[PDB]
Design an enzyme around this catalytic site. Structure first.
Site, PDB file in Angstrom:
ATOM      1  N   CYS C 134     -14.907   6.922  -4.317  1.00  0.00           N
ATOM      2  CA  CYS C 134     -13.713   6.067  -4.522  1.00  0.00           C
ATOM      3  C   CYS C 134     -12.654   6.214  -3.441  1.00  0.00           C
ATOM      4  O   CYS C 134     -11.963   5.252  -3.174  1.00  0.00           O
ATOM      5  CB  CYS C 134     -13.102   6.209  -5.966  1.00  0.00           C
ATOM      6  SG  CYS C 134     -12.238   7.779  -6.151  1.00  0.00           S
ATOM      7  N   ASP C 135     -12.600   7.351  -2.732  1.00  0.00           N
ATOM      8  CA  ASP C 135     -11.564   7.521  -1.723  1.00  0.00           C
ATOM      9  C   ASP C 135     -11.764   6.438  -0.626  1.00  0.00           C
ATOM     10  O   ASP C 135     -10.806   6.038   0.042  1.00  0.00           O
ATOM     11  CB  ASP C 135     -11.604   8.892  -1.017  1.00  0.00           C
ATOM     12  CG  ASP C 135     -11.759  10.120  -1.958  1.00  0.00           C
ATOM     13  OD1 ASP C 135     -12.188  10.052  -3.126  1.00  0.00           O
ATOM     14  OD2 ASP C 135     -11.400  11.180  -1.445  1.00  0.00           O
ATOM     15  N   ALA C 136     -13.000   5.992  -0.414  1.00  0.00           N
ATOM     16  CA  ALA C 136     -13.323   4.991   0.639  1.00  0.00           C
ATOM     17  C   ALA C 136     -12.514   3.744   0.408  1.00  0.00           C
ATOM     18  O   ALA C 136     -12.263   2.994   1.347  1.00  0.00           O
ATOM     19  CB  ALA C 136     -14.817   4.643   0.592  1.00  0.00           C
ATOM     20  N   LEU C 137     -12.058   3.513  -0.828  1.00  0.00           N
ATOM     21  CA  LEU C 137     -11.243   2.276  -1.113  1.00  0.00           C
ATOM     22  C   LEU C 137      -9.798   2.284  -0.557  1.00  0.00           C
ATOM     23  O   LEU C 137      -9.154   1.223  -0.446  1.00  0.00           O
ATOM     24  CB  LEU C 137     -11.293   1.936  -2.619  1.00  0.00           C
ATOM     25  CG  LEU C 137     -12.666   1.715  -3.256  1.00  0.00           C
ATOM     26  CD1 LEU C 137     -12.484   1.404  -4.782  1.00  0.00           C
ATOM     27  CD2 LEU C 137     -13.457   0.574  -2.544  1.00  0.00           C
ATOM     28  N   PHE C 138      -9.326   3.469  -0.130  1.00  0.00           N
ATOM     29  CA  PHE C 138      -8.097   3.587   0.674  1.00  0.00           C
ATOM     30  C   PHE C 138      -8.423   3.427   2.178  1.00  0.00           C
ATOM     31  O   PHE C 138      -7.559   2.927   2.931  1.00  0.00           O
ATOM     32  CB  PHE C 138      -7.414   4.966   0.557  1.00  0.00           C
ATOM     33  CG  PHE C 138      -6.112   5.067   1.315  1.00  0.00           C
ATOM     34  CD1 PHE C 138      -4.926   4.655   0.723  1.00  0.00           C
ATOM     35  CD2 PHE C 138      -6.053   5.530   2.644  1.00  0.00           C
ATOM     36  CE1 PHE C 138      -3.709   4.768   1.375  1.00  0.00           C
ATOM     37  CE2 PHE C 138      -4.822   5.587   3.336  1.00  0.00           C
ATOM     38  CZ  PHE C 138      -3.653   5.239   2.700  1.00  0.00           C
TER      39      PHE C 138
END
Lengths: 348, 345, 342
Positions: C134-138
């Site tokens: 989910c960090d990839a969405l930043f």
């Protein structure tokens, strides 16, 4: 106690430390903003011989690979070489300084054709001689002069003179003893001229600071018997005389020389170049010693614009004419000017 | 309280911060001045594990592309690889650190011929063995030992030892138990023997501090069972006894070891190397715990030469007289080495 | 006096100056830690217009020669391009900014096959879509969005949305209104399920901070009439309502969102992302005005974790009063940059 020798040396170090922790450039670390800044670092080293100045000079020269910036027709792009030349002379170490990239720049700049020399430009700024704006007279002449001296090639000085005379003949206002920044600011004498808010000619303080500070750097190293020296000595004295005469009451010159009432506070970077050039001329006996109190009052006023953490404040951002500044506004060339003023104030 | 663990930690961090904000080098960021500095930063990390130390170590290693400097015959130019070897061991990332440039340096340094090995140099310095000056024993031996350790190639140690013995045979004064800087300072009994104003032999405090602090780094990581280990242990104990014996009353050694009265104040970088090496030896049990108060006296003296903004002062330059404002990156490295051992006492 | 405009502007400048004096990276100056950090610096400039922020942005972009990092399949390596696009738009200057290295990265990232898109990975993390954590969405969506806007190429947004929906379909917990970090943290009702010490699902505060912070940045610049906009608004509103709902008494979210009791003290970096995103939405009218006190309370608790020399403390590494990271200073600047506007 702003006139105390340790006060002034500690203030200078703090200004260096503040600016080293806040690196900045208009377009590149090797651009004119850092060239003016490290030129002040170089003179601060010259007076105090403090290793910290020489560390910073060496740091940046190595990081930049001894390169000027890359617009070879452009005087701004060689201003950084002053610092390179200074380190080369003062850091006696083999396989370290490299003056080839400076030599290459200067050869193209001086001896090769370009659009500005060709006079084919048709703009308001009138970019039809190599040094078509007055700031160029800080950026290129002191470097060409120090290069000619260190390399023992006097012919560079002749080429320097040819271009300096073009600027002088275009922009030096013989009646006012100050430089217009570029052709836009020269009067034709009618209702379409550019004027200050009070109707006077526009003479920008930092703009003239570049010229007179360039004169002090030039005369510092030009041979005593150079065939055109008198020209430079006399320009220097004429400009010094006017700048003294128009110094505001509180010691700080405003960004506008003839319309200082348009600004609420004096501006540090132009005041610092004047104080540098003036203190230099008093110390050299080119300016009468009775001017010492006026040069000291400027020094006091600029010293009081320096923040506790070392930031030199009240510096106008980059430009080409009179504009306001504020108490937190800074620039690397403004730190450089403060370092210049200090390096001469110390020698009085 | 300069002996409080939290005082020492915050002091060491401030010394790092102030030196990081004032980068400096003699000829290049990868030169011995920086190698000694970042070797102190490495040992500070190793004691404290503070991420700030390791950040600074990784930042310079990447900015330098893991390269030592370029004169492959010159021990000063590999000093920086100590930090690289320390990062490769302690920053637990595969495919991050590069030790190949360090290997290329050491292989040419130790195994290929060069003009100093050839013995033909005719200068007063007498550059006729690989490590012809005593400071070289801080610069190269600790790195060759760490390299040999991480590569598990003990032949590098045998080669280190060969060159180390040449330096020892030329420069270690067996009666004085201190090293001469180079042949110029070795007495031959003739007219241009170099003497202090009091008639004594000239032994440089930081010169000896490079040697003994290099000995502490070496013995920190050399195998317990290495065939030549006793030689280094006894060298270390001999120099340590003499260095303790000649320590000035206020704690700080002067730049001159046998003529301290030639200087009006102690000098911090040499004293910090001594303090590091002495504290290390007490903590390892090589030096008797009764010498703690003297090691502590030296730390207190140096701690009082640190400015409020962290600058380590009273450091003699590479020379202008050492003063309260005078600093160097290797002086901050030496102060971090000292702190790194004082902390564990 | 943490709500005064001056205190706030000078705290943010101090945070910047401290971080600039303490450069740090995981593996390279152009890696995601620095991308996050400079993205906070760009937003601080956007609000304050202080030349100091822009000098720092220009400095690193020239030092890094405008290059993202080098794994073109990897969302982390393009995070630093947000700062480069920001500079290109905002520093009006010829022959200075270079967006070609960002364009190359995005063309390969979005339009060329790679091992993660191919779905052949067989591990616990389940690296079988492009943005599998989910960090990839930043890291990637805000850069894509800003590149699409400056280049007038909305087809990039379409490709962004395809990959965003994959990560959403996998990892957004529709009942909890929070993201799981990767497949390891999603429940399938067996003994392999990961649980907090108190039996709850694992939702990481910073993990979720990246998503919701990403969504504020995205909504800041996505065209109002973009055909997929409502999905992003609705998601942002759902996450924000939950993060508000679970905010601990003293203002600071702990590293664990559903088990805050497993920690003695709140954590700043996650909190600062929440505060940025929540303050952003109140300012934009997407979140009710009435939540101001909860966001103000976060900012105050964070402000009290800044040292006198500027250090942003209580930041968990990749946590103690001293522990910092560049992306924690970045999150602090993001929060400040919106608090200023309330």
């Amino acid at each position: 106690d702003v006139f105390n020798e340790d006060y002034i040396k500690t203030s200078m170090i703090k200004a260096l430390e503040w600016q080293e922790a806040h690196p900045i450039f208009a377009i590149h670390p090797t651009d004119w903003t850092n060239g003016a800044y490290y030129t002040g670092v170089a003179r601060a080293h010259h007076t105090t011989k403090n290793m910290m100045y020489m560390a910073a000079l060496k740091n940046q020269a190595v990081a930049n690979n001894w390169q000027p910036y890359t617009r070879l027709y452009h005087a701004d792009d060689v201003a950084i070489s002053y610092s390179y030349l200074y380190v080369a002379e003062n850091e006696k170490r083999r396989n370290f300084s490299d003056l080839e990239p400076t030599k290459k720049f200067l050869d193209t700049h001086l001896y090769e054709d370009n659009a500005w020399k060709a006079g084919t430009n048709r703009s308001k700024e009138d970019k039809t001689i190599l040094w078509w704006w007055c700031d160029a007279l800080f950026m290129a002449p002191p470097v060409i002069n120090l290069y000619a001296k260190q390399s023992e090639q006097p012919e560079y000085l002749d080429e320097m003179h040819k271009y300096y005379m073009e600027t002088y003949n275009r922009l030096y206002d013989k009646e006012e003893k100050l430089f217009a920044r570029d052709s836009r600011f020269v009067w034709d004498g009618d209702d379409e001229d550019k004027k200050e808010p009070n109707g006077e000619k526009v003479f920008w303080s930092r703009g003239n600071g570049w010229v007179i500070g360039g004169l002090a750097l030039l005369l510092e190293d030009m041979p005593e018997d150079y065939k055109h020296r008198d020209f430079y000595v006399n320009l220097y004295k004429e400009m010094a005389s006017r700048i003294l005469e128009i110094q505001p009451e509180d010691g700080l010159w405003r960004t506008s020389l003839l319309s200082p009432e348009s600004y609420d506070h004096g501006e540090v970077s132009g005041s610092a170049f004047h104080t540098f050039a003036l203190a230099w001329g008093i110390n050299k006996g080119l300016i009468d010693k009775k001017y010492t109190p006026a040069v000291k009052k400027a020094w006091k006023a600029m010293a009081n614009c320096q923040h506790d953490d070392g930031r030199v404040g009240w510096v106008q951002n980059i430009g080409a004419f009179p504009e306001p500044a504020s108490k937190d506004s800074y620039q690397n060339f403004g730190t450089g000017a403060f370092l210049l003023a200090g390096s001469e104030i110390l020698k009085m």
